[PDB]
């Protein structure tokens, strides 16, 4: 027989459709709405990414149908046939749906009926194919059945299209509604209305036990709210099916897999279709590119059993009920708590996968006799076991979940006769550098070494890398910092590039950039709530900074994600203001001095902020360093700094410094540096001196050569 897949059926639990092997359907998408069918070659690549399914946005609907000259359904048939044929012979599943195009959150009822009058009987016999009635027919979620739904009548469209499909394809799985925003216990309650209205029409009774149907939903409420809505709906007896979602790594400023929601959907037993495309083309991000899928799975510790290939690797958490270890928690609106991760509870999975050890035997013999890591009993406070026989090159991964991002005290309980080296990365990103661990003088003589780290939010593998041997490891600890990165107080914010401040506007509760006028609207109380996170409130009325559909100010207190801001030091006296939600940094746009925005980390001055006492002197701006013709001379010029008596010109040979002060008492906004060596790069900054008080250094100026 052919490798064509057997018809999906609801699982015993009644949570989703699973394939002919009892496993969830997991896949990316492709479109044939205004483009050719993706080639066999590229659709095949799906199987190497642990996918067994493809989402097809088949055609997009015309609002004007069936007026003269409007595009009818059927126009893409020759390409949709190719996708059906190609997924058939690749042993993949296929979810076919009607796309929206430019008309998002909308549908045409008659276009959809005639779409399924055509396509339903055409693929009825195709066991690997499922029908999802329509992508996001309403703006933007339940209840569709409300008269004030935008637009109304979607439930009637679903009812009509289900009846059309069952006539022409009685065995074929149907995915309903495709709620764009499906969030909260509210979301589930509102969907139940639409589900009950649907069931009363089709089956005659508000509560029907579906044998071959499920609620399709998307992830645009966010992972927390979507998970709550799915849990609730599953409890009411209705299988679900994720058909479109996205997230990305915290701090990337880009899309890709929502790792957090995938983990929750894996736990609840829910099949999913992520919104990354099969090459060559698509409207979002390419699923074959590491940054948008494979690396995100690889960095997080996420695992499932793939239908084809050997990725992802089989792995999991040891202890803690097989669930990623939480790092901190909110207790009286302050981020606190110490999580102890025992070193001998490294993830299971294998040698080369969840740990690397130099041999396959546990020479110590304790705790985990079937694995390669070397474990003995320890005589340290709290008893238990320690990882010993640590050779250089070895490593141990522990899957954790940093629900609250920011600054954490990372602690290693260590013993060793002599010193040793280690390095810790989180999500395959170095957070420590080379960490010199002290000599204790014995192999059960214990001490705690501690180092401060900046963790991003989400599932992430903590990985101890042993750069030297000769130490034993008992446990690891993370707790959020109890003392902040900057003292509590009232401050003025000045952007490093342009010297501008942030100002409250009570009339529309907005925050906008302006020149530091010295007023209370441009003054801000700062209060640390654990983890380097801060509540930032205006001085005049006690209203808190809020990053949500713009950048404004609100009455409710700051423990929710939009009202919380990580103040992250640069190292050179400035800070960047990281947003707790996505990990992007608050910056003024180099391009438009008025526009405030959130972008991913870069070296530029426009992303950096001075958080200063109100009376502190302003730093210089606009520094520009240019080489003079035919000679060793750098001509510096900058803008005059308010209240400056003089300037100090400083120079370094790499970006960021340190900066050796080449000249002081400059009573002018320009300088000529004669001591520049032939054909070498130089980096300049300038500070001002106001009433004996030296300011911060300006933004860096790279020495500019000729064309
Ligand atoms: Ca071993
Ligand atoms: Ca070992
Ligand atoms: Ca231990």
XYZ file of C-alpha atoms and ligand atoms in Angstrom:
710
model
C 0.000 0.000 0.000
C 0.838 3.729 -0.307
C 2.148 5.848 2.595
C -1.092 7.934 2.383
C -2.240 8.554 5.915
C -5.324 7.038 7.486
C -8.320 9.168 8.356
C -7.954 11.329 11.506
C -10.268 10.423 14.378
C -10.982 12.026 17.723
C -8.806 10.632 20.540
C -10.286 8.710 23.503
C -9.855 11.807 25.685
C -11.844 13.913 23.148
C -9.359 16.821 23.017
C -8.336 16.805 19.290
C -7.996 14.935 16.064
C -5.047 12.554 16.068
C -3.642 10.651 13.083
C -3.706 6.952 12.201
C -0.912 6.379 14.785
C -2.778 8.094 17.662
C -0.472 11.157 17.562
C -1.368 14.864 17.241
C -1.247 16.648 13.911
C 1.602 19.184 13.980
C 2.484 21.384 10.992
C 3.353 24.715 9.331
C 1.339 26.426 6.567
C 1.446 27.245 2.881
C -0.842 29.281 0.603
C -2.192 28.903 -2.891
C -4.372 32.044 -2.740
C -2.442 34.123 -5.333
C 0.634 31.894 -5.868
C 1.682 28.506 -7.269
C 1.656 25.315 -5.200
C 4.792 24.930 -3.079
C 7.040 22.276 -4.698
C 7.255 18.634 -3.534
C 10.946 19.257 -2.589
C 10.038 21.980 -0.079
C 6.813 20.380 1.278
C 8.943 17.269 1.988
C 11.248 19.342 4.243
C 8.348 19.516 6.752
C 8.971 15.872 7.752
C 12.521 16.740 8.925
C 11.122 19.357 11.363
C 8.948 16.867 13.279
C 5.806 17.825 11.341
C 3.214 15.393 9.959
C 0.681 17.974 8.669
C 0.287 21.024 6.409
C -2.121 23.958 6.673
C -3.399 25.188 3.276
C -4.945 28.635 2.839
C -6.447 27.506 -0.475
C -8.141 30.587 -1.900
C -9.141 33.999 -0.543
C -12.770 35.142 -0.787
C -14.130 38.092 -2.840
C -16.480 40.369 -0.815
C -18.436 41.385 -3.947
C -19.378 37.817 -5.093
C -21.471 36.899 -7.022
C -21.636 40.363 -8.649
C -20.533 40.685 -12.314
C -16.729 40.365 -12.702
C -16.015 39.148 -9.111
C -13.609 36.202 -8.581
C -15.531 32.940 -8.046
C -14.334 29.947 -6.013
C -12.383 27.271 -7.944
C -9.731 29.511 -9.554
C -6.811 27.875 -7.648
C -7.995 24.220 -8.117
C -4.962 23.200 -10.257
C -2.584 24.248 -7.486
C -4.731 22.879 -4.609
C -4.727 19.522 -6.456
C -0.919 19.581 -6.408
C -0.808 20.231 -2.636
C -3.297 17.335 -2.122
C -1.223 14.971 -4.354
C 2.076 16.010 -2.753
C 0.926 15.672 0.872
C -0.752 12.342 -0.084
C 2.477 10.719 -1.289
C 4.625 12.338 1.433
C 2.385 10.735 4.120
C 1.302 14.107 5.516
C -2.053 15.391 6.670
C -3.667 18.432 5.022
C -6.032 21.042 6.505
C -7.712 22.993 3.665
C -9.298 26.380 4.409
C -10.671 29.586 2.860
C -8.319 32.576 3.310
C -9.170 36.262 3.888
C -6.565 38.183 1.875
C -6.958 41.918 2.488
C -10.395 41.447 4.100
C -9.229 40.163 7.494
C -11.912 39.335 10.077
C -14.531 38.974 7.354
C -16.300 36.503 5.045
C -18.774 36.131 2.160
C -21.437 33.509 2.917
C -22.317 32.556 -0.679
C -18.639 32.414 -1.793
C -17.962 29.961 1.070
C -20.975 27.751 0.231
C -19.925 27.493 -3.452
C -16.290 26.931 -2.389
C -17.329 23.821 -0.428
C -19.939 22.714 -2.976
C -16.930 22.392 -5.299
C -14.012 21.248 -3.083
C -15.811 18.999 -0.541
C -16.797 16.243 -3.046
C -13.472 16.667 -4.905
C -11.367 15.651 -1.870
C -14.036 13.646 0.074
C -12.243 10.352 -0.608
C -8.812 11.768 0.405
C -8.310 10.232 3.881
C -5.329 12.484 4.760
C -7.370 15.700 4.131
C -9.415 17.696 6.706
C -11.757 20.683 6.048
C -11.515 23.891 8.117
C -14.622 25.884 7.081
C -13.213 29.435 6.978
C -10.282 31.467 8.312
C -11.158 34.257 10.787
C -14.681 35.023 9.468
C -15.390 37.683 12.162
C -13.372 40.523 13.746
C -12.063 39.050 16.010
C -13.638 36.211 18.016
C -16.688 34.866 19.822
C -19.554 35.279 20.113
C -20.194 35.247 16.332
C -23.916 34.667 17.120
C -24.330 38.214 18.523
C -26.166 40.685 16.241
C -23.294 43.171 16.823
C -20.648 40.682 15.580
C -18.436 42.217 12.874
C -19.852 41.009 10.554
C -22.983 39.086 11.712
C -24.332 35.764 10.367
C -21.127 33.660 10.595
C -22.910 30.928 12.582
C -25.490 30.547 9.759
C -22.546 30.329 7.294
C -20.921 27.602 9.437
C -24.223 25.728 9.732
C -24.870 25.944 5.974
C -21.289 24.908 5.049
C -21.291 21.934 7.477
C -24.500 20.634 5.863
C -22.924 21.075 2.405
C -19.741 19.211 3.498
C -21.589 16.279 5.136
C -23.639 15.681 1.969
C -20.511 15.504 -0.198
C -18.003 14.179 2.348
C -19.650 12.326 5.276
C -16.391 10.771 6.622
C -14.262 13.993 6.388
C -13.136 15.810 9.630
C -14.451 19.387 9.908
C -12.831 22.280 11.837
C -15.278 25.030 12.862
C -15.288 28.774 13.630
C -11.510 29.488 13.453
C -11.739 32.053 16.248
C -8.960 34.639 15.752
C -8.890 35.786 19.408
C -9.885 32.930 21.721
C -8.939 34.030 25.233
C -9.928 33.650 28.895
C -12.818 31.899 30.616
C -14.856 34.634 28.908
C -13.658 33.409 25.504
C -14.721 29.829 26.216
C -18.140 30.955 27.521
C -18.784 33.035 24.378
C -17.730 30.140 22.100
C -20.127 27.785 23.954
C -22.968 30.075 22.851
C -21.900 29.729 19.181
C -21.308 25.978 19.628
C -24.765 25.564 21.229
C -26.469 27.689 18.546
C -24.694 25.532 15.940
C -25.671 22.230 17.568
C -29.350 23.236 17.964
C -29.435 23.900 14.192
C -27.507 20.892 12.892
C -28.191 18.123 15.430
C -31.398 19.523 17.031
C -30.013 19.748 20.584
C -27.743 22.437 22.119
C -25.416 19.794 23.622
C -24.219 17.272 21.043
C -21.380 14.767 21.383
C -19.303 15.387 18.241
C -17.804 12.272 16.609
C -15.904 13.962 13.739
C -15.652 17.734 14.446
C -13.620 20.252 16.464
C -13.366 23.964 17.312
C -10.565 25.590 15.284
C -8.935 28.519 17.033
C -5.955 30.891 16.724
C -3.446 32.210 19.304
C -3.843 36.015 18.980
C -5.149 36.436 22.561
C -1.635 35.411 23.749
C -0.582 32.053 25.175
C -1.892 32.504 28.771
C -5.398 33.608 27.786
C -5.595 31.051 24.952
C -4.558 28.184 27.290
C -7.271 29.187 29.800
C -9.886 29.334 26.991
C -8.826 25.910 25.631
C -8.787 24.241 29.112
C -12.307 25.535 29.740
C -13.703 24.444 26.363
C -12.107 20.986 26.687
C -13.837 20.636 30.095
C -17.181 21.381 28.381
C -16.668 18.362 26.066
C -15.546 19.893 22.731
C -12.280 18.956 20.971
C -10.138 21.871 19.824
C -7.517 22.327 17.102
C -4.970 25.152 16.834
C -4.860 26.276 13.189
C -2.780 29.529 13.303
C -0.482 31.231 15.812
C 2.891 32.892 16.308
C 5.207 34.344 18.955
C 8.986 34.298 18.726
C 11.861 34.413 21.196
C 11.606 36.977 24.003
C 13.793 39.920 22.994
C 14.186 39.036 19.296
C 11.606 41.581 18.110
C 10.546 38.978 15.512
C 8.071 36.175 14.892
C 8.378 32.393 14.826
C 6.953 29.618 17.004
C 5.052 30.590 20.156
C 7.024 28.096 22.285
C 4.919 28.867 25.384
C 1.584 28.025 23.707
C 3.010 24.937 21.961
C 4.064 23.526 25.373
C 0.551 24.151 26.755
C -1.101 22.571 23.667
C 1.202 19.526 24.035
C 0.140 19.217 27.688
C -3.631 19.503 26.995
C -3.441 17.091 24.024
C -4.110 19.596 21.265
C -2.936 19.366 17.636
C -1.499 22.610 16.178
C -0.660 24.431 12.948
C 1.983 27.177 13.396
C 2.062 30.352 11.211
C 5.459 29.869 9.586
C 5.474 29.012 5.893
C 6.885 26.369 3.575
C 9.298 27.995 1.083
C 9.547 29.634 -1.332
C 6.929 32.265 -0.316
C 4.526 33.281 2.468
C 3.197 36.306 4.396
C 4.904 35.572 7.747
C 8.272 33.853 8.422
C 10.103 30.879 6.851
C 9.741 27.694 8.977
C 12.971 26.122 7.578
C 15.015 29.090 8.948
C 16.397 28.209 12.450
C 15.498 31.521 14.160
C 11.755 31.052 13.344
C 11.246 27.403 14.454
C 13.998 24.757 14.948
C 16.291 26.842 17.192
C 13.249 27.954 19.218
C 12.305 24.304 19.826
C 15.972 23.437 20.399
C 16.604 26.299 22.878
C 13.462 25.713 24.973
C 13.677 21.983 25.829
C 10.457 21.379 23.902
C 9.933 17.764 22.766
C 7.370 15.500 21.081
C 7.464 12.180 19.195
C 7.910 13.069 15.468
C 6.162 10.891 12.834
C 9.266 10.926 10.592
C 12.979 11.463 11.306
C 14.673 11.776 14.715
C 13.973 15.441 15.644
C 12.985 16.651 18.155
C 15.010 14.396 20.423
C 13.099 12.484 23.080
C 13.796 14.243 26.384
C 12.126 15.537 29.516
C 12.300 16.925 33.022
C 13.584 14.682 35.833
C 11.492 15.328 38.969
C 8.922 18.101 39.416
C 6.157 15.936 37.869
C 7.870 16.047 34.462
C 7.204 19.816 34.249
C 9.690 22.646 33.673
C 10.959 24.081 36.933
C 9.497 27.487 37.862
C 12.076 30.126 38.920
C 10.139 32.780 40.885
C 6.688 33.993 41.923
C 4.741 37.111 42.989
C 4.200 37.416 46.755
C 2.541 40.705 47.791
C 3.399 42.366 44.449
C 7.180 41.691 44.837
C 9.063 39.142 42.708
C 10.702 36.700 45.113
C 11.442 32.998 45.731
C 14.386 30.594 45.546
C 14.138 27.573 43.234
C 16.620 24.813 44.032
C 17.500 22.642 41.031
C 19.433 19.568 42.225
C 22.328 18.842 39.827
C 21.492 15.107 39.687
C 18.004 16.030 38.268
C 19.378 16.936 34.806
C 16.911 16.291 31.945
C 16.603 12.673 30.785
C 16.991 12.081 27.035
C 20.475 10.777 26.280
C 24.225 11.183 26.031
C 24.734 13.993 23.523
C 21.126 15.268 23.932
C 20.199 16.300 27.520
C 23.769 15.839 28.879
C 27.234 14.902 27.661
C 29.402 12.589 29.767
C 32.706 10.996 28.682
C 31.369 7.419 29.169
C 28.003 5.646 29.258
C 28.308 4.217 32.827
C 27.391 5.909 36.114
C 30.662 5.111 37.945
C 29.287 6.608 41.177
C 26.364 4.173 41.082
C 23.669 6.225 42.862
C 20.265 7.685 41.874
C 20.223 7.051 38.103
C 22.019 3.789 37.276
C 20.929 3.580 33.580
C 22.419 6.957 32.521
C 25.928 8.253 31.806
C 26.167 11.046 34.435
C 28.292 10.218 37.488
C 26.404 10.502 40.778
C 27.429 9.804 44.428
C 25.885 10.414 47.870
C 26.808 13.821 49.346
C 27.567 14.787 52.954
C 26.420 18.415 52.451
C 23.581 20.151 54.324
C 20.252 18.803 52.994
C 21.782 15.395 52.209
C 20.903 13.735 48.910
C 23.348 13.263 46.024
C 26.024 15.185 44.090
C 27.211 14.968 40.466
C 30.915 14.004 40.567
C 33.562 12.857 38.054
C 33.047 16.068 36.028
C 35.543 16.053 33.110
C 36.090 19.146 30.949
C 33.801 19.327 27.934
C 30.965 17.671 29.886
C 27.621 19.348 30.313
C 24.202 19.029 31.921
C 20.931 20.572 30.665
C 18.005 21.389 32.953
C 14.723 22.554 31.392
C 13.288 25.455 33.411
C 10.548 28.043 32.854
C 11.343 31.706 33.555
C 7.778 33.042 33.733
C 9.010 36.437 35.039
C 11.977 37.872 33.094
C 14.808 39.968 34.510
C 17.803 39.779 36.793
C 18.398 36.645 38.869
C 21.058 35.596 41.359
C 22.389 32.347 39.873
C 24.081 30.158 42.516
C 26.169 26.958 42.230
C 26.833 24.804 45.319
C 30.336 23.489 44.596
C 33.220 21.473 46.041
C 36.755 20.943 44.689
C 40.291 20.375 46.030
C 41.601 23.017 43.613
C 39.853 25.701 41.547
C 37.745 25.062 38.463
C 35.948 26.725 35.557
C 32.379 26.526 34.397
C 30.067 28.498 32.086
C 26.260 28.642 32.120
C 24.108 29.342 29.079
C 20.295 29.689 29.030
C 18.433 28.875 25.793
C 21.860 28.404 24.156
C 22.914 31.968 25.078
C 25.864 32.629 27.398
C 24.741 34.510 30.541
C 27.872 34.197 32.759
C 31.098 34.248 30.769
C 33.979 32.151 32.119
C 33.126 31.597 35.785
C 36.106 30.934 38.047
C 34.970 28.653 40.870
C 37.135 28.773 44.008
C 39.113 25.921 45.578
C 37.364 24.546 48.678
C 40.145 22.119 49.719
C 37.978 18.946 49.638
C 35.580 16.948 47.425
C 32.832 17.071 50.080
C 33.852 20.552 51.314
C 31.077 22.788 49.999
C 30.711 26.509 49.232
C 28.182 28.564 47.244
C 29.421 30.609 44.277
C 26.951 33.210 42.988
C 26.680 35.329 39.831
C 24.020 37.747 38.577
C 22.364 36.965 35.191
C 19.742 38.446 32.834
C 17.158 35.800 31.900
C 14.560 36.149 29.139
C 11.004 34.893 29.639
C 9.841 31.389 28.648
C 10.882 27.748 28.512
C 14.656 27.552 28.378
C 17.360 24.967 28.932
C 19.872 25.922 31.623
C 23.146 24.278 30.552
C 26.168 23.929 32.845
C 29.335 23.714 30.690
C 32.396 22.359 32.539
C 35.411 24.182 31.049
C 37.649 22.386 33.549
C 37.256 19.223 35.600
C 38.122 18.641 39.254
C 34.855 19.786 40.886
C 31.674 18.267 42.293
C 28.212 19.848 41.925
C 25.374 19.408 44.460
C 22.683 21.881 43.301
C 21.826 25.011 41.343
C 19.710 27.949 42.580
C 17.906 30.881 40.995
C 16.133 33.639 42.878
C 15.243 37.110 41.548
C 17.391 40.017 42.761
C 16.060 41.555 45.982
C 18.042 44.822 45.594
C 17.339 46.737 42.367
C 19.668 47.801 39.536
C 19.033 51.489 40.373
C 17.897 53.055 43.668
C 14.255 53.969 44.254
C 13.620 57.703 43.853
C 12.365 60.447 41.549
C 14.329 60.846 38.294
C 14.439 62.457 34.857
C 14.803 60.292 31.745
C 17.178 61.625 29.066
C 17.746 59.682 25.812
C 21.480 59.266 25.051
C 21.354 60.028 21.308
C 19.263 63.255 21.264
C 19.118 64.331 24.940
C 15.303 64.355 24.910
C 13.086 63.473 27.889
C 9.784 61.661 28.350
C 6.730 63.751 29.307
C 3.257 62.935 30.691
C 0.181 64.391 28.937
C -2.883 64.090 31.206
C -5.407 65.179 28.509
C -5.073 61.869 26.608
C -2.935 59.942 29.164
C -0.108 59.743 26.571
C 3.676 59.848 26.923
C 5.606 61.815 24.283
C 9.179 63.080 23.876
C 10.029 66.730 24.516
C 12.882 69.000 25.646
C 13.629 68.774 29.390
C 11.781 71.898 30.586
C 12.345 71.065 34.320
C 8.657 70.401 35.120
C 6.806 67.739 37.158
C 5.261 66.240 33.974
C 8.819 65.111 33.053
C 9.610 63.660 36.534
C 8.988 60.004 37.432
C 8.915 57.895 40.611
C 10.770 54.571 40.252
C 9.992 51.549 42.495
C 11.708 48.133 42.295
C 9.347 45.126 42.508
C 11.994 42.373 42.373
C 13.956 41.002 39.418
C 15.167 44.329 38.105
C 11.485 45.043 37.236
C 10.081 48.472 38.029
C 6.851 50.373 38.451
C 7.332 53.812 36.883
C 4.794 56.458 37.941
C 4.519 60.201 37.217
C 5.413 62.718 39.924
C 2.234 64.872 39.613
C -0.472 62.210 39.815
C 0.447 58.665 40.927
C -0.313 57.075 37.519
C 1.847 54.234 36.135
C 3.662 53.818 32.797
C 1.815 51.338 30.557
C 3.027 49.777 27.287
C -0.155 48.697 25.489
C -1.514 50.007 22.133
C 0.956 52.867 22.461
C 2.848 54.212 25.461
C 0.639 55.916 28.042
C -0.160 56.148 31.730
C -2.901 54.460 33.848
C -4.647 54.233 37.260
C -4.296 50.467 38.021
C -1.119 49.205 39.873
C 1.935 47.645 38.144
C 2.191 43.823 38.506
C 0.590 42.905 35.122
C 3.042 42.619 32.213
C 2.265 45.951 30.418
C 2.797 48.094 33.568
C 6.209 46.479 34.378
C 9.610 47.510 32.968
C 13.082 46.027 33.467
C 15.757 48.705 34.036
C 18.851 47.015 32.533
C 22.267 48.730 33.052
C 24.570 49.246 30.044
C 27.806 49.303 32.093
C 28.777 52.889 31.115
C 26.358 54.819 33.408
C 23.296 54.452 31.154
C 20.411 51.940 31.230
C 18.095 50.413 28.658
C 14.397 50.054 29.495
C 13.359 46.494 28.537
C 9.642 45.780 28.101
C 8.452 42.808 30.215
C 6.013 41.637 27.485
C 8.246 40.935 24.457
C 11.751 41.895 25.705
C 12.137 44.759 23.231
C 13.858 47.930 24.403
C 12.179 51.333 24.692
C 13.858 53.743 22.245
C 13.360 57.000 20.367
C 13.439 56.343 16.613
C 16.603 57.421 14.762
C 14.512 58.660 11.832
C 11.821 60.486 13.831
C 12.751 62.211 17.184
C 9.044 62.215 18.255
C 8.273 58.493 17.712
C 8.747 56.228 20.760
C 8.965 52.518 19.922
C 10.090 49.077 21.112
C 12.908 47.358 19.200
C 15.419 44.571 19.750
C 18.863 45.158 21.322
C 21.478 47.147 19.383
C 24.534 49.295 20.254
C 22.993 52.627 19.169
C 22.575 55.555 21.557
C 18.883 56.087 20.732
C 18.085 52.880 22.696
C 19.894 54.107 25.853
C 18.550 56.316 28.625
C 20.095 58.311 31.430
C 17.928 57.864 34.566
C 19.157 60.875 36.538
C 18.379 63.100 39.528
C 16.344 66.115 38.290
C 19.104 68.658 39.069
C 21.958 66.679 37.408
C 23.786 68.338 34.458
C 22.856 67.391 30.867
C 25.386 65.394 28.804
C 26.619 66.552 25.340
C 25.028 65.347 22.052
C 25.622 65.077 18.308
C 29.326 64.194 18.428
C 30.904 63.865 15.000
C 34.537 62.806 14.380
C 36.066 63.287 10.904
C 39.615 62.756 9.563
C 41.379 65.774 8.015
C 42.843 65.642 4.495
C 46.293 64.084 4.014
C 47.204 64.033 7.733
C 46.939 62.403 11.151
C 44.176 64.647 12.537
C 40.653 63.900 13.784
C 38.371 66.964 13.795
C 35.671 66.574 16.500
C 32.495 68.705 16.723
C 29.408 68.381 18.951
C 26.324 70.313 20.179
C 26.563 72.664 23.141
C 25.328 71.082 26.398
C 23.120 73.306 28.644
C 24.971 74.831 31.620
C 28.397 73.470 30.597
C 31.513 75.390 31.729
C 33.855 73.113 29.762
C 34.167 69.692 28.094
C 36.445 66.671 28.444
C 37.287 64.908 25.174
C 37.812 61.137 25.687
C 39.112 58.439 23.335
C 39.286 54.649 23.091
C 40.401 52.066 20.520
C 37.231 49.852 20.706
C 33.476 50.660 20.907
C 32.080 51.227 24.408
C 35.448 51.981 26.045
C 37.024 52.330 28.479
C 37.809 55.908 27.311
C 41.162 57.556 28.153
C 40.731 61.323 28.614
C 43.009 62.915 25.971
C 41.957 66.504 26.824
C 40.138 68.605 29.447
C 39.138 72.266 29.977
C 37.897 72.550 26.363
C 35.851 75.763 26.405
C 34.417 75.227 22.908
C 32.182 72.756 21.007
C 34.974 71.431 18.759
C 38.335 69.730 19.181
C 41.275 68.694 16.988
C 43.108 65.513 18.029
C 46.655 65.456 16.596
C 47.687 62.115 18.134
C 45.889 59.638 15.827
C 48.152 56.829 14.574
C 48.328 56.005 10.846
C 45.504 53.698 9.658
C 43.870 52.670 12.966
C 40.259 53.038 14.203
C 39.354 55.426 17.055
C 36.200 55.894 19.177
C 35.395 59.255 20.781
C 33.065 60.428 23.517
C 32.745 63.810 25.220
C 31.408 64.796 28.645
C 30.627 68.279 29.965
C 31.602 69.896 33.282
C 28.916 71.999 35.043
C 29.790 73.645 38.401
C 32.527 71.078 39.142
C 30.258 68.121 38.257
C 31.298 65.967 35.261
C 28.328 64.574 33.304
C 27.878 61.236 31.545
C 29.766 60.553 28.316
C 28.039 61.382 25.027
C 27.015 58.844 22.433
C 30.016 57.340 20.692
C 31.496 58.866 17.551
C 33.361 56.535 15.186
C 36.200 58.353 13.408
C 34.974 58.805 9.813
C 37.506 58.392 6.992
C 37.118 59.723 3.386
C 35.191 57.920 0.587
Ca 30.046 8.409 33.275
Ca 31.375 12.288 34.369
Ca 22.073 17.377 45.006
